[PDB]
Subunit: 114 residues, 3 copies
Amino acid sequence: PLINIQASVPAVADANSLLQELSSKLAELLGKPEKYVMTSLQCGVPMTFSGNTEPTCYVEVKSIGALDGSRTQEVSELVCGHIEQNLGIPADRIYIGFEDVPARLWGWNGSTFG
Amino acid sequence: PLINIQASVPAVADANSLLQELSSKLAELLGKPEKYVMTSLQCGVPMTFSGNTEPTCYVEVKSIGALDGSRTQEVSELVCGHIEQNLGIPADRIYIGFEDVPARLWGWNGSTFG
Amino acid sequence: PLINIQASVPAVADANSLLQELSSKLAELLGKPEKYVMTSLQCGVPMTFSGNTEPTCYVEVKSIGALDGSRTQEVSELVCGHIEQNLGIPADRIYIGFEDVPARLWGWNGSTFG
């Protein structure tokens, strides 16, 4: 899995801890070995939401499967909650774009997962 | 809707105004309440286009529907025009990646739009 | 084509050269005129992979076609190799997300390729 966060708030000293905690939580929820979870946090990005510059966040989440049924709701609950708590961005100012990526469209280690 | 801009030119003092103007224009064109429009601008990114480092720009645009028929052309005209005017990046050095995202793949406020 | 690199390692003085070399190599592999290749490199991004902050990299690659059969494997070999050599990021800490984008979903020069 992959989770990339782009946030309007200033950079945080505990970015590494925040991402590591997000990484383990996401592995468990998706039923993936944490070995395969990649995360990022880019703060200080000029953003608007609803026409204003209040704290806001865009997240992209990708996985090879594991996003069936209630999973995208459950991931959103996890991710919005984690970001609310750790970055102080209200959940109603967070967007998440999900993609279930075919394994052959996912490169790793000089090849693909397909 | 979502519009994320990644540009090679230096950061601009009027990023907020630029994004707010883009936000209202995009809401109107897509027929979406501006409440739901998210935007970003990341400048100063090392980029090449056509093998050179002249001013260039990558934009991602996402929407839950509203990208039918001539819409992607019309959005491109709006976006390239806005960026040309405000960042001084020629329209022929702007790329836009569009995605019509299913509502269940769009997280917001601890849940999804599906 | 489009290749956007997001890396955890510090910014490099030779980003332009690195991207230009990647640009020509990618054009040749995909059978696209280099005119149409867009690249970027964003370094210094807080990232984890496998739960740790060792050098790691996320790449997105998009093309209008040209990603059939063995192509995504071949692109991954090229890209992981180039990044390993130039940024010192091990290939086993590199992820690549691929998308074959319909031409009508690819904006350029105030219109789309469709």
